[PDB]
């Protein structure tokens, strides 16, 4: 997986990401409105008057399980995978706000409008895995951005890490410190035409566009994925409408996509992208296509009673 | 530019190409029927009853220019840009097909329904580039498959170079024969699950998917282009269905699209891929979306008068 | 620069250093015998009778301040830059068993005999930077390894990391952590000649050897050399003699030279392998060879008076 | 192998190689005299008074079968591997100078006193490939150098090409066009301090030297060690003495070193840099170190009965 934020030029929020995986868990659209009644796993605190909230997940035991979500006010959240490093308590801590891990992005979207609020409010949170009935544990971190920045949270065996994500980007395995450090080999890349030049009397000048940018990794692993997303998101021109940022979050995340036949999996399947979602906060609207059909599907708040009670999935 | 095909069980070809460029031309699906009258400009000859002909190009001097084209027999055709390695003869030479650079997709679409057709005329064609006083000359290399293989037509100051396709894609500069050396250096590339494996006392795993495929480039240069889309056409499962293998062949094209800001030209705008185009000798549909909207649309030979005398356009 | 270990098959250290600058400091072969008397600066506890220590280094106030040594049991270590990550105290910690940044190679090696017995007693010791007013900051940490094993010692400011070394080799910055993550991007090259494949139709063949290697870094940056040189030292057939383990020692190391004119440091200067220094349990000998003179030259322990009280700085 | 040229600011040649192999064939350093009588194989003619020659290699039926060799005026000339690519006719061609292949390297430094004297003799000359029953047929092409320039010298089934090694450096296959394509994948590399950068809001900086050269591959392959020490030759500064360009010879050489256990060849063993000679025109002496000496020996034109009549080969 891998997930992308960037900013317009009025503060905006832009925010997606890939599903890659082998098989698909029949997620949805799925909207929880604000007259939604949720209890929270471990008597999580909360807003009085809630947000509303949109994304993409599953509805399990009337709780919906979100893949990734965003609510009315420019904040939104990314699950992605983090195996063998992600490491949770399986018992809640007193005097700590305790969240299980699936609830996380519900919580997160539910109760705060910023970056700011979340990064403050996780200082005192126990993230508690819960073990879902007929499913393996999940191990995540997650990517939560709004209009101005986004973090990096990864709950591993020595504590809570919440890293501050200068790139605006995030992928899989491993630590977000090695990934930030990786960067550094890649520093010298460009998009810019490369300068012609010579080594001794032969005289170097590019065939023509990208050569510039050689050294830029082209696997569909996740420390590459990571290093091509980065330098894509980074060197994006700013756009000003919703319609061309709203393709530059798709084409953004376009760079890292996952097609057949590229990298199996250890259980001999191929990894593929099976969905792209993606949030706008000018338009509280939420995108998506799929493997099979890249048309780019839009599901707007305003067109959905925010104050009902009862879960919403469109098919 | 990158061009791609591969067929079915069905032996059904499958056609298409990245246009990366700074900008538009104002081309569009155009539509040749066989009615329309063509005069070729050195008096090449051709089939009597032309085939069919659906593409994308502009019209200029009522006549039908294509980016790249295929015809109702499962033949296609692309144009993509070879400048400092393409060279042509200015003038015709007698006794042979004279053929100019412009008009060699029409002319091939339209007189030919196979690539083994194709290969065998084009021992006797000259590709002549007629010069235009303002404007540069078109600089191309072409692409040319149908349902069994394809081939690369690479006219060079040194004669004309068919080569037989094997990997069934096709980008920019160098030589085709540079590219299919380059591939050599990326032959322990796999798609396989990277085995665990020790350097000294050190076991080494991968975290996930992907590391066997480490190795291959990323960058949108022309060479590192051809590795990535050669490795992914080859690696891609076969399909059995229209709407699968037209899938297959946009998210082939996908894997070495042009993302604005990736890489400037020479004259400081960014290059980006514009529009994608396919073609199914299956249905005889071509398909397109651009960069602008990924939806890809369709437009069957079956959908216009293939027996009118005009050329038809639709405008995006 | 770069640190190398690796093991005969009867158990004996073979302990190599590159040491990559842009000028020399003076630096001779010093040898410390086992009357010369010290006292450590914060009273650090060690031996009663020590032991015989040689290496590379020079000397401040009758100092042995040296870059890399070992002594007579086989036991070696080596101090290798590491400025951003390098963080020490700069007062001695009761309890402890304070250690000056300076003398903690000579402190190693004059004290203990293994890799286990200095892993042992590094839980309780406090590496203190005595900061020279006239002078900057020595950021260092240190490779240390005997006939069994190697460790990695990265003080910073979380604290002290002792890393099990289990590619025997360390270069520069980031952390330990980083190198071993970054090595199973590799995992996939092989020492093997490349198995012929086919991509669609297209027949893959090495032109010879070195193709199953494509993929290891070539540049001389931190992270590169590291990859390159573990990947070097784990693929090296075992030898039996000291002849061909020296040799396998500087070969190693010299697969990540830096040659004059590969890369500028800050002041625009350029870094070169100044010299490489090696060492063999098996004979109780100190290797070395520098950027200028090529050949190996060899000073062994059992040429000097080891009961003697003076420091033995050999020139030329 | 490697080959490599260069030169000071006297216009000095400086010439080397590296002898990349599984196995010796027992070659040594071997001087022709002036005195000494040859006969052609095919009648080539030849200068009246021939010039000195120095070299590497071995005498069969009392020919010198140079691997690489010099004469006393500061042409050099070096034999490197070259199957799949290699081509030449089996007979003799009337109105030319017919020249077989194992006498290629004697032939034109006996001969001829420049690369520009070698250039004009090639247009009339045939590489005549005579093979004995028990061994197998040499494939090589041929790296030629003096104090200004070198060329490449690639006899294939399409007629022999003499290329302008701008580069000044030459290993095995692919053809010398592709390696000169192939350099401009890396034309952004440089030995310059990575610049501070950002991407977005992070702030990018090189943790030392060596950040700007990243992208060079570090595999012993032939078209990657190509890349590496054309790099390493091109950046190098100039010396302006014996001992400094010796230094420099080795070391760039030292680059792409094969070291054992990198990279196994098709019958299972590894291949290693057996030898490393060289040639200095300044002093008429040819260098040479090998994979268990790093010694460098020196051999001194001066030192040999230059008017002698029989071959002198130095043992071991
Ligand atoms: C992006 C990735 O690579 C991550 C793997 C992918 C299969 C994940 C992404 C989101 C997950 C779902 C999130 C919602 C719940 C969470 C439950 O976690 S648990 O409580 O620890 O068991 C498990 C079920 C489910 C539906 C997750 C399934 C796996 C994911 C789709
Ligand atoms: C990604 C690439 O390789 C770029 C290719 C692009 C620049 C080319 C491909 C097809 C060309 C057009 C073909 C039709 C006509 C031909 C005219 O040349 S002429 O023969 O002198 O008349 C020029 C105009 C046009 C529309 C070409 C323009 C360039 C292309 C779009
Ligand atoms: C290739 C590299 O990583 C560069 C390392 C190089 C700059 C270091 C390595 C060993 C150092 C010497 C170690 C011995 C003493 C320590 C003194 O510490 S201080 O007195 O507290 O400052 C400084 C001098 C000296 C000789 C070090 C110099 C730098 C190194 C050679
Ligand atoms: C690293 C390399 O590319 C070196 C390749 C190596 C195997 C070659 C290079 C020089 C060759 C020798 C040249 C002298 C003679 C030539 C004879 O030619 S033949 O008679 O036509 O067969 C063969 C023997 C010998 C000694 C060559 C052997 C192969 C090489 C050492």
Redesign the pocket.
Known sequence: ?TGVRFSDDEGNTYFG?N???SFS?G?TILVTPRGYHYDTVFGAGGKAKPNAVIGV??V?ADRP???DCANEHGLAIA???FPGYASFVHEPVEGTENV???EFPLWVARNFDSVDEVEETLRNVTLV????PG????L?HWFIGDGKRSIVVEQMADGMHVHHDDVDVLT?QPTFDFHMENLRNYMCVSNEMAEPTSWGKASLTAWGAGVGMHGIPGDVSSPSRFVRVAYTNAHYPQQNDEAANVSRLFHTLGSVQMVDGMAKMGDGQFERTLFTSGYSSKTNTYYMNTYDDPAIRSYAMADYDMDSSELISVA
């Open positions: 997986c990401r599903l890659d995986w868990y997620e997940g599953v399990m399980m979100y893949f699950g992605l995978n299980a891990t699936f895995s819960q073990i879902v499913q393996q544990e999940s995540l899989n």
